[PDB]
Ligand binder design. Structure first.
Ligand SMILES: OC[C@H]1O[C@H](O)[C@H](O)[C@@H](O)[C@H]1O
Ligand SMILES: [Ca+2]
Ligand SMILES: [Ca+2]
Ligand SMILES: [Ca+2]
Ligand SMILES: [Ca+2]
Ligand SMILES: [Ca+2]
Ligand SMILES: [Ca+2]
Ligand SMILES: [Ca+2]
Ligand SMILES: [Ca+2]
Ligand SMILES: [Ca+2]
Ligand SMILES: [Ca+2]
Ligand SMILES: [Ca+2]
Ligand SMILES: [Cl-]
Ligand SMILES: [Cl-]
Ligand SMILES: [Cl-]
Ligand SMILES: [Cl-]
Ligand SMILES: [Cl-]
Ligand SMILES: [Cl-]
Ligand SMILES: [Cl-]
Ligand SMILES: [Cl-]
Ligand SMILES: [Cl-]
Length: 671
């Protein structure tokens, strides 16, 4: 049919950054400390003035204590600002209803979860337990069906109202289970946590999970970001349609970006917003996290998120106006490395493994996901045909694809599936469909695709759509140059084949509704955590549930119209989730990858490494922190643990010695 081989070994990528590997519990623990500390102005300008309760009351009985042994530069000092530059825009503050805050670490810094996984890049193997975040501990029953979860006892929201099970329950019942509410990210569906999995309150600081499978420990990662982020239930519940006279759109848009001081479990709170300009966050006085010395975290008092572009984030970091960047667009690498070459540069650049991938995803729903018309339906039928996918992938010159982004040692031939940069990857297991355009052309002719009008474009058979020319719609993320470069390239190569492809370029917010809704034929997408880690959001590897897959979901309400490879892939993923055996887990992924790549669950375009860019003044930045693994580096670096020595501190605070106001008020509080 096609002469399949294994993908070629990429060029050697030296002068990277080595991770200092550590055991799971070297990072944090939950203990009551003898005495506690904070910035002197809080005690002298707020506590003594009345304005705030003493620190001891603001903190839980047992706070989250960061161990100093795991701190790269040791225990810190208070002061300075973290200046971010984002390419996104806020929709509002309702994360659990599916509103974007702008990305670039803004929703990571606000919405804290039951567990935490991003810092697990530094723990040895891939059978690691996620770190206890809002849930301090958990026990499994002798059978493996029940998880008793113990929450942090005594934590408060950034406004002062207690954090308890009512917030965890509100999210599970009124967002996850509730079919009308859709949490931000497109993957917090009920089955993400297992089919027929329930959750129930015991007491205010104890919740109980009930799983259909025995010890499906892989779900503790789904309890981390983005899928299990509780919101301020005392603010959200009176706006919720089950609890009020609000529609689901009224609830969704109940808190516009202008609405200030929204209650968070995160280290900073939004105090200022200026459309297309800036969002300013100030340290949360009710933060439940401290260091071994009793100092109430964070160290940095202020966070900025400049509303600009994704490319400008890179430009501004190497120049020194922005403090942080994930350099992920190969079109920026050369400019960034040139500025990095200067020894007097304000930022340090550090490349990691090839964990950034892009895949072509085809809509596999033939039972009407996204309500397709006759032309739409005809493409879903082509997409599900294995000979059409084999020809589409073989018409791709993958060497030229990589070279269209950046020439050199960065890119790797990527057929699809598991990222080559991850441990779970097996090269022998990956199926490579080499560049064979003439072969691809002949395969499309064999399924009934020939040019009928002599224009150079292929045609549907006489029986399909009146024998009209083939028309495919490609959904593209408008916020990235890479996505666009790839989208245009694919169109040019699909044109050489004969397939006519139309670019539908939408803004991030729009693109997600058109994708998660099913309103697409083909799409270009950057790979999420499951292809970069396997262990994080494993449910997205196959259609295990009716909404767990990026390219094969079913309409509400209907069962999946799965293909035999997808059915076998879902069996692999379900077995992997409930497996505690590492050798079984390693060969389950060798199996998974082979089924993926040979069947073409997605069609790989290219893969490459991103670099972490941080301003040199920042301390406690872990060595070898990837830009993307269990999550984005914003999460991985532990920003509440970052600090700056007082002789290095910048003068960038826009509300110095101020704290957040009340939810709904103007902004921050002084004087
Ligand atoms: O959420 C963090 C994440 O947001 C966007 O997707 C950016 O492109 C990423 O590099 C990273 O900043
Ligand atoms: Ca003082
Ligand atoms: Ca994104
Ligand atoms: Ca686990
Ligand atoms: Ca130049
Ligand atoms: Ca070289
Ligand atoms: Ca190829
Ligand atoms: Ca034609
Ligand atoms: Ca569905
Ligand atoms: Ca089967
Ligand atoms: Ca550092
Ligand atoms: Ca360091
Ligand atoms: Cl003491
Ligand atoms: Cl220690
Ligand atoms: Cl300070
Ligand atoms: Cl939160
Ligand atoms: Cl109301
Ligand atoms: Cl805006
Ligand atoms: Cl090279
Ligand atoms: Cl490895
Ligand atoms: Cl962080």
């Amino acid at each position: 049919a096609f002469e399949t081989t294994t993908p070629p070994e990429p060029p050697q990528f030296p002068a990277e950054g080595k991770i200092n590997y550590v055991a799971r519990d070297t990072i944090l623990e939950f203990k009551a400390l003898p005495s506690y500390s904070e910035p002197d102005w809080i005690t002298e300008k707020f506590e003594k003035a009345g304005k705030l309760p003493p620190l001891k009351e603001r903190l839980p009985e047992e706070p989250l204590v960061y161990k100093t042994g795991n701190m790269p530069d040791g225990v810190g000092v208070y002061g300075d600002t973290m200046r971010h530059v984002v390419g996104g825009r806020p929709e509002g503050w309702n994360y659990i209803a599916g509103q974007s805050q702008g990305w670039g670490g803004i929703d990571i810094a606000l919405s804290e979860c039951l567990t935490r996984t991003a810092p697990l890049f530094q723990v040895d193997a891939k059978d690691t337990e996620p770190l206890p975040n809002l849930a301090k501990s958990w026990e499994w029953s002798e059978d493996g069906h029940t998880l008793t979860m113990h929450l942090v006892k005594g934590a408060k929201w950034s406004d002062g109202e207690a954090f308890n099970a009512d917030d965890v329950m509100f999210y599970w019942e009124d967002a996850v289970v509730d079919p009308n509410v859709s949490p931000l990210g497109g993957g917090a569906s009920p089955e993400a946590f297992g089919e027929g999995t329930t959750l129930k309150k015991i007491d205010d600081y104890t919740v109980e999970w009930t799983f259909k499978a025995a010890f499906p420990k892989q779900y503790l990662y789904t309890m981390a970001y983005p899928s299990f982020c509780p919101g301020p239930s005392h603010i959200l519940k009176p706006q919720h349609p089950k609890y009020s006279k609000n529609t689901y759109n009224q609830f969704k848009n109940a808190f516009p970006p202008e609405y200030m001081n929204m209650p968070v479990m995160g280290a900073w709170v939004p105090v200022s917003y200026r459309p297309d300009d800036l969002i300013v966050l100030r340290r949360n006085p009710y933060y439940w996290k401290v260091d071994e010395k009793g100092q109430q975290l964070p160290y940095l008092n202020e966070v900025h998120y400049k509303l600009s572009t994704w490319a400008d984030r890179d430009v501004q970091a190497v120049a020194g106006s922005g403090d942080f960047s994930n350099l992920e667009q190969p079109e920026n690498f050369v400019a960034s490395l040139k500025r990095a070459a200067d020894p007097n540069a304000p930022a340090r650049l550090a490349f990691g493994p090839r964990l950034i991938g892009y895949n072509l995803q085809m809509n596999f729903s033939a039972n009407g996901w996204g309500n397709p018309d006759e032309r739409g339906q005809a493409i879903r039928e082509l997409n599900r045909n294995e000979v059409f996918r084999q020809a589409v992938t073989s018409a791709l010159d993958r060497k030229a694809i990589g070279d269209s982004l950046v020439k050199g040692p960065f890119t790797a031939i990527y057929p699809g599936g598991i990222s080559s940069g991850t441990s779970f990857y097996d090269r022998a297991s990956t199926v490579y469909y080499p560049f064979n355009l003439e072969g691809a052309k002949a395969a499309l002719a064999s399924i009934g695709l020939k040019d009928t009008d002599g224009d150079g474009f292929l045609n549907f058979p006489k029986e399909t759509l009146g024998g009209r020319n083939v028309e495919i719609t490609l959904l593209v993320n408008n916020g990235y140059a890479t996505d666009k470069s790839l989208a245009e390239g694919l169109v040019g190569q699909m044109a050489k084949l004969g397939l006519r492809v139309v670019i539908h370029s939408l803004d991030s917010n729009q693109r997600d509704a058109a994708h998660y809704g099913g309103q697409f034929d083909w799409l270009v997408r950057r790979n999420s955590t499951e292809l970069s880690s396997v262990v994080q959001n494993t449910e997205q590897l196959a259609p295990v549930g009716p909404r767990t897959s990026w390219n094969h979901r079913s309409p509400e309400g209907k069962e999946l119209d799965l293909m035999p490879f997808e059915k076998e892939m879902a069996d692999i993923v379900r077995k992997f989730i409930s497996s505690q055996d590492n050798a079984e887990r390693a060969d389950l992924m060798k199996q998974y990858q082979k089924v993926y790549t040979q069947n073409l669950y997605t069609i790989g375009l290219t893969e490459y490494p991103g670099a972490l860019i941080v301003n040199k003044r920042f301390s406690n930045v872990p060595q070898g922190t990837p830009i993307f693994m269990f999550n984005w580096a914003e999460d991985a670096i532990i920003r509440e643990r970052l600090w700056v020595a007082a002789d290095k501190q910048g003068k960038y605070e826009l509300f110095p010695q101020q704290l957040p106001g009340k939810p709904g008020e103007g902004g921050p509080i002084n004087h």
